[PDB]
Structure formats: C-alpha cells, structure tokens
C-alpha cells in the first residue's frame, strides 16, 4: 500500500489520498485527516501491522517528502514514527518537479526516486517491479554500492 499525505506548516494532515487501491481500506480505518503527521503515520503503520502488510520479514517502510531547515523537522518526525514502531526506514527527499513526474506515472515519490536510481546504475528494474515489488525487495536491488551515500 502507498499513501500520500498533505500537511500544513504545523504538520497537521490536511489531505490524504490512496496512491493505489489497496491503500483505501487502510486510509478508511486510519482516518488521518486533520491529525498530527506523527499520529497519522503511527496509526497507518499500526493498521498495516494488523492487516499483515508489516511483519518481521518485511520490516522496512519507505517515506518520501517534498516541501512546497523545515524538512529536517519533517524528517525527524518520520524517523520517530518508524523507530517507535520498531520498523526500519528509508527516507528519500524529493522535489515538486519529481513529485509531478511521479504522479504522472502513478508512483509515489519514493518508488519513483528508487526506479530512476536503479536505471541510472544499470539495475534491471522494469516499471512493474518498481510499482509492485516490496519495499525490502526493491531496496536490496537498488542499494548495491554504485552511488553516493551520506548522512
């Protein structure tokens, strides 16, 4: 499941959309609208664990974010959400330019960034795999030491 949230400057969720059909039931039970970003994502992860999407094997969540040191506050919230839930995380900063390219092909900002990155490093990742492979699977395929890493 892929979910897109819109937040205001105080990190209140003002809009929420399922980026695929199997995100709809999780959004309905989570009801993230008007909630704090931390609360919204924490319940989304809680529901995901209940429904079976998050488990000991696939224990990685992929976040991506774009503005319009503010993003650092957002990034800290995303780290807290994952650590407090006991799941590993990858956070991929994005841009409005890339978000629109992702929307145009019905991909999340995170999967789009990862799909583009794999192509540039010569990894065999077709469009269907980029959209449907599990988070832990696509990260194992793309993160092979062929591009720069930093913290």
């Amino acid at each position: 499941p892929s979910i897109g949230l819109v937040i205001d400057k105080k990190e209140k969720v003002i809009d929420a959309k399922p980026l695929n059909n199997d995100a709809k039931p999780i959004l309905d039970e989570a009801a993230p609208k008007d909630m704090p970003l931390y609360d919204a994502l924490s319940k989304i992860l809680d529901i995901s664990k209940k429904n079976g999407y998050i488990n000991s094997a696939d224990n990685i969540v992929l976040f991506s974010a774009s503005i319009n040191k503010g993003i650092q506050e957002i990034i800290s919230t995303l780290k807290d959400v994952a650590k407090d839930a006991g799941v590993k995380f990858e956070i991929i900063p994005s841009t409005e330019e890339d978000r629109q390219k992702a929307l145009d092909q019905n991909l999340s900002m995170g999967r789009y960034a990862i799909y583009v990155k794999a192509v540039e490093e010569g990894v065999n990742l077709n469009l269907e795999d980029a959209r449907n492979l599990s988070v832990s699977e696509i990260l194992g395929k793309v993160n092979i030491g062929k591009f720069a890493i930093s913290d």
């Binding site: 897109g4 998050i54 976040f63 974010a65």
Partner: peptide, 10 residues
C-alpha cells in the same frame, strides 16, 4: 500546502 509526504508499505 506546506509539504507532501508519501509512505510505501509492503
């Protein structure tokens, strides 16, 4: 408005 956040699970 201020920021967009996507989350991918499974």
């Amino acid at each position: 408005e201020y920021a967009y956040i996507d989350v991918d699970i499974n």
